[PDB]
Amino acid sequence: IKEMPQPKTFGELKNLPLLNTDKPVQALMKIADELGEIFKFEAPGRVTRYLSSQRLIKEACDESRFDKNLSQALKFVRDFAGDGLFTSWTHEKNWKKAHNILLPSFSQQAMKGYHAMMVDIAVQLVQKWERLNADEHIEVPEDMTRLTLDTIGLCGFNYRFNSFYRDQPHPFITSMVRALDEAMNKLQRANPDDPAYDENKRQFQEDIKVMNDLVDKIIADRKASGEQSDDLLTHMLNGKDPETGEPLDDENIRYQIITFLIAGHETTSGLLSFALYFLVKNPHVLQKAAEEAARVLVDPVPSYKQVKQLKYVGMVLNEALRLWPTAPAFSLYAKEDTVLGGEYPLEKGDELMVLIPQLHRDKTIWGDDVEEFRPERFENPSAIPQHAFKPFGNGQRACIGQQFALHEATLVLGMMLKHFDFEDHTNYELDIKETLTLKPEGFVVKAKSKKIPL
Numbered sequence: 001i002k003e004m005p006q007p008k009t010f011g012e013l014k015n016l017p018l019l020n021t022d023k024p025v026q027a028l029m030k031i032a033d034e035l036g037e038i039f040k041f042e043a044p045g046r047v048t049r050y051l052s053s054q055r056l057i058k059e060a061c062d063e064s065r066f067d068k069n070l071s072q073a074l075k076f077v078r079d080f081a082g083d084g085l086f087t088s089w090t091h092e093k094n095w096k097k098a099h100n101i102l103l104p105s106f107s108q109q110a111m112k113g114y115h116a117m118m119v120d121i122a123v124q125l126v127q128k129w130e131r132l133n134a135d136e137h138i139e140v141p142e143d144m145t146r147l148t149l150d151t152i153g154l155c156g157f158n159y160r161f162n163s164f165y166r167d168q169p170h171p172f173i174t175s176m177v178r179a180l181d182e183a184m185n186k187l188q189r190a191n192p193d194d195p196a197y198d199e200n201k202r203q204f205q206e207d208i209k210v211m212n213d214l215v216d217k218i219i220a221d222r223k224a225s226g227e228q229s230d231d232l233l234t235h236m237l238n239g240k241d242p243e244t245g246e247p248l249d250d251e252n253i254r255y256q257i258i259t260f261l262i263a264g265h266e267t268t269s270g271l272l273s274f275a276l277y278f279l280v281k282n283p284h285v286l287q288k289a290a291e292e293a294a295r296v297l298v299d300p301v302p303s304y305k306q307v308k309q310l311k312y313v314g315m316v317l318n319e320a321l322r323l324w325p326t327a328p329a330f331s332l333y334a335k336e337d338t339v340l341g342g343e344y345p346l347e348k349g350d351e352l353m354v355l356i357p358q359l360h361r362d363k364t365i366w367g368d369d370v371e372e373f374r375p376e377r378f379e380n381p382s383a384i385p386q387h388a389f390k391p392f393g394n395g396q397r398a399c400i401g402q403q404f405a406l407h408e409a410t411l412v413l414g415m416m417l418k419h420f421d422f423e424d425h426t427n428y429e430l431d432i433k434e435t436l437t438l439k440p441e442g443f444v445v446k447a448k449s450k451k452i453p454l
């Protein structure tokens with residue numbers, strides 16, 4: 001039995017002021033580098049333990065011992081994402097019900113059906129970059145967010161956000177981004193009930209009402225039209241849970257749609273941005289990925305089967321998820337008293353935080369070249385120890401969107417590498433902005449067309 005370390009305290013506020021920063025995940029990463037594989041973190045009325053080693057995380061990923069917990073971030077997101085899949089407890093009736101209904105909508109098979117819609121948006125991104133003048137550059141996370149938001153709108157509910165037609169966001173997205181900003185900002189507040197936060201609280205309540213009103217109208221409009229478009233909203237209106245025999249109610253469908261819009265906006269766009277960042281910093285890797293793109297994508301429009309053959313591009317995306325898992329943490333609670341790694345006794349209900357970027361830097365797993373970008377690490381999943389690589393979370397509470405995200409990211413990165421050469425014209429210095437998720441901020445490149453027709 002070992003006594004785990006704890007970072008510096010601030011009297012009655014304990015560790016809470018360590019989160020008073022615009023980059024709290026990167027701050028926690030630095031604490032993990034100093035303190036090691038486990039540390040205690042305390043706030044008024046809160047204790048958790050930050051895990052960084054595959055040795056301890058492999059135990060945390062035992063579903064017989066640990067279930068998904070809502071971190072404070074997810075509790076604050078629940079104020080608008082409700083009992084949607086991402087912000088529900090495993091024991092809430094709507095979790096397993098929505099999980100059973102939606103799993104077929106998110107399978108590798110279902111991706112054949114979403115592929116044409118994904119290609120519609122990917123082609124819009126390629127045509128935008130083709131049409132840039134020689135003196136112009138690309139705002140990478142901006143354009144990746146335009147793509148991923150538009151893809152989930154079209155596959156979610158046959159709705160065009162038309163992000164490539166715009167500078168200014170859709171009213172739903174103004175409210176969604178501001179609600180995510182209030183949720184993630186409220187985490188750090190030493191004195192949340194201070195009157196200085198009354199405008200923040202008023203504006204939050206207004207943003208929740210906006211998201212609810214606009215999504216409720218999308219659902220109402222679809223039931224009214226009777227249209228049977230092959231999208232998630234149709235699957236949720238028609239689907240029955242095989243267990244209960246019940247469909248989702250309109251309020252839960254709204255929470256699922258809000259949840260999918262958060263994911264499309266925040267996560268896949270981060271992955272594509274980090275992937276292109278690592279490729280321009282690693283020209284030998286960029287060349288090898290570009291060679292695969294050219295050899296496989298032999299038609300003007302990629303097919304589903306061709307995306308499945310971009311294996312090296314898939315490895316590039318996994319190695320980007322290794323160094324910068326854009327959804328960087330998940331939380332677990334002990335189902336019963338249990339001992340972690342033979343050294344740390346936990347009681348029933350005790351909380352754990354998995355710090356995914358630190359897990360992914362465990363040198364006992366990846367070796368001394370752990371900071372290097374090497375997609376070849378992923379050639380043989382059987383050579384990777386259990387629970388070493390967790391960018392989609394764990395077990396039954398893992399990302400339902402994983403096949404969707406990787407299909408879209410593989411398609412688009414393959415088209416980008418086929419159609420353009422890239423230049424890191426500014427020698428960009430990685431600056432990671434934290435919203436719900438991690439993204440390169442200010443990452444810009446130049447793209448020179450290979451002049452290959454669509």
Ligand code: HEM
Nearest residue numbers: 085086260263267268327330391392393397399400401405
């Ligand atoms: C690279 C892209 C993505 C990454 C890295 C990612 C990552 C994650 C992670 C780590 C979790 C587990 C969270 C936890 O345990 O608290 C999760 C859950 C989830 N993700 Fe994603 N995600 C991605 C894309 C998407 C997309 C595109 C969708 C839907 C359009 C989506 C929907 C969800 C849902 C609904 C859950 C909750 C699943 C459940 O518990 O039933 N994600 N995601």
Ligand SMILES: O=C(COc1ccc(OC(F)(F)F)cc1)N[C@@H](Cc1ccccc1)C(=O)O
Nearest residue numbers: 043046071072073074187327328329353436437
């Ligand atoms: O450690 C984190 C990291 O923040 C994120 C958690 C989940 C998250 O979701 C996702 F990974 F899905 F993006 C994003 C960021 N959050 C903790 C921070 C905290 C706050 C107060 C007391 C103690 C600890 C949490 O939200 O509980």
